[PDB]
Amino acid sequence: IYNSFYVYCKGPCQRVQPGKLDVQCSTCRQATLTLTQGPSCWDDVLIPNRMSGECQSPHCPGTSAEFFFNCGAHPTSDKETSVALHLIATNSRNITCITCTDVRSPVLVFQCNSRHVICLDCFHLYCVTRLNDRQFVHDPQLGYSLPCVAGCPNSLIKELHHFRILGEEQYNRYQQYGAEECVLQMGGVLCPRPGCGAGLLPEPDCRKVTCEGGNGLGCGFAFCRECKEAYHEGECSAVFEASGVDERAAEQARWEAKTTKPCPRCHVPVEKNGGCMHMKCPQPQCRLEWCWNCGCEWNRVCMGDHWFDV
Amino acid sequence: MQIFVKTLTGKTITLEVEPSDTIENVKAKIQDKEGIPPDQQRLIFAGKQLEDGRTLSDYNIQKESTLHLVLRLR
Ligand SMILES: [Zn+2]
Ligand SMILES: [Zn+2]
Ligand SMILES: [Zn+2]
Ligand SMILES: [Zn+2]
Ligand SMILES: [Zn+2]
Ligand SMILES: [Zn+2]
Ligand SMILES: [Zn+2]
Ligand SMILES: [Zn+2]
């Protein structure tokens, strides 16, 4: 099976799995929207109202396509959607990993200018070590993320669901660490009482902070913002004694570092559109719909598994 | 769908929401459940503070997912 799309299944699977793409009319919300042409890239499926066509349902003037992803490891309730991870790709280009230099699949492709690629095993390691060391980066607009391993500029992962690679317990830890980091960057504080750690955003010019709330919300500890001990009027007395990528590999691990198949019906040759695997024969007397990848007539399987490639 | 709102303590509030629900609406439902006025609430997803005029779907927050609640002390 050729899978173009990876999702996170949150039960039954509870893991990153091959995904199935599907489309519905945005108005009637039925699988009635036939597209003029298939999606060719991730923007086509992720940005609302980007793609258009015709609702086959007659009691509907719908024209706009709504794309959604389901897990590919089992049948799903029609509305049992999973989050797509648009950075993950099948390694159809045989690109080496920036860290381990192996040709693995699937891979993650960073949105740096170089489009550096890392295998999902090395991405996991990156995430775990950086989460354990609290070296994830906080951006006020993007949240708790990681950049390209090469440290390229403007390369923080935007879709934070990619951190689902970490697994359920570690994902929760990531979100916990992210919240704490968000608080601290806002000039807030965490309650220092063991078993609490409540996030508090007090006035910037206040030294006494109370862990406010009832027995449900807060613990009532009043602390000094400076030393993080209980509030006091003196100087702070607490003392804390501090105990305490290769360039060649990076060059090769770039995503952008023959292709003629005859049409099954009319046999006029065609080269790939790059992305869309859904061919509609451009010859006016044929117009056979077929899959580039499989050389077969178009079907729901090719649709779900590899409507487009990267 | 359900979202879980958690304090950094681990205390969990269960809400029934829709993707189209605003963060302000989420705060209203928190007010109703815990009696925290919306003004005193700050909601965070994956390290990002959520804006009141944005929807859950704007942040791609999925069913069963968890928002972190932090308190604004004035
Ligand atoms: Zn699944
Ligand atoms: Zn329709
Ligand atoms: Zn890079
Ligand atoms: Zn690797
Ligand atoms: Zn506390
Ligand atoms: Zn102090
Ligand atoms: Zn043809
Ligand atoms: Zn196919």
Author numbering:
A (entry chain C): 142 to 385, 393 to 405, 413 to 465
B (entry chain D): 1 to 74
Original paper wording:
To understand the conformational changes upon mutation in the basic patch on RING0, we also crystallized phospho-Parkin R163D/K211N/Q347C (3C)-pUb complex after treatment with 3C protease, which washed off pUbl-linker (1-140) from Parkin core (141-465). This complex resulted in better crystals diffracting up to 2.35 Å. The overall structure of the pUbl-linker (1-140) depleted Parkin R163D/K211N/Q347C (141-465)-pUb complex (hereafter R0RBR R163D/K211N-pUb complex) was similar to the autoinhibited structure wherein RING2 was bound on RING0 and REP element was bound on RING1. In the crystal structure of R0RBR (R163D/K211N)-pUb complex, out of two molecules of Parkin in the asymmetric unit, one molecule of Parkin showed nice electron density of the linker region of Parkin. While T410, I411, and K412 were facing outwards in the apo R0RBR structure, in the structure of R0RBR (R163D/K211N)-pUb complex these residues were present in the core. Interestingly, we noticed interactions between the linker of Parkin and pUb from the neighboring molecule of the asymmetric unit. The core of interactions between the Parkin linker and ubiquitin was mediated by I411, which was involved in hydrophobic interactions with the hydrophobic pocket of ubiquitin. Other interactions between Parkin and ubiquitin included ionic interactions mediated by K412, and H422. Water-mediated interactions between linker and ubiquitin included T410 with the carbonyl group of R72 of ubiquitin, and T415 with the carbonyl of G35 of ubiquitin. Furthermore, E409 formed a salt-bridge with K413, which could be required for maintaining the structure of the linker region for ubiquitin binding.
Parkin is an auto-inhibited ubiquitin E3 ligase activated by dual phosphorylation of its ubiquitin-like (Ubl) domain and ubiquitin by the PINK1 kinase. Parkin is an autoinhibited RBR family E3 ubiquitin ligase consisting of an N-terminal ubiquitin-like (Ubl) domain followed by four Zn2+ binding domains RING0, RING1, in-between-RING (IBR), and RING2. Like other RBR-family E3 ligases, Parkin binds to an E2, and ubiquitin is transferred from E2 onto the catalytic C431 residue (on RING2) of Parkin before ubiquitination of lysines on target substrates. Furthermore, C431 on RING2 is occluded by the RING0 domain of Parkin, which inhibits Parkin activity.
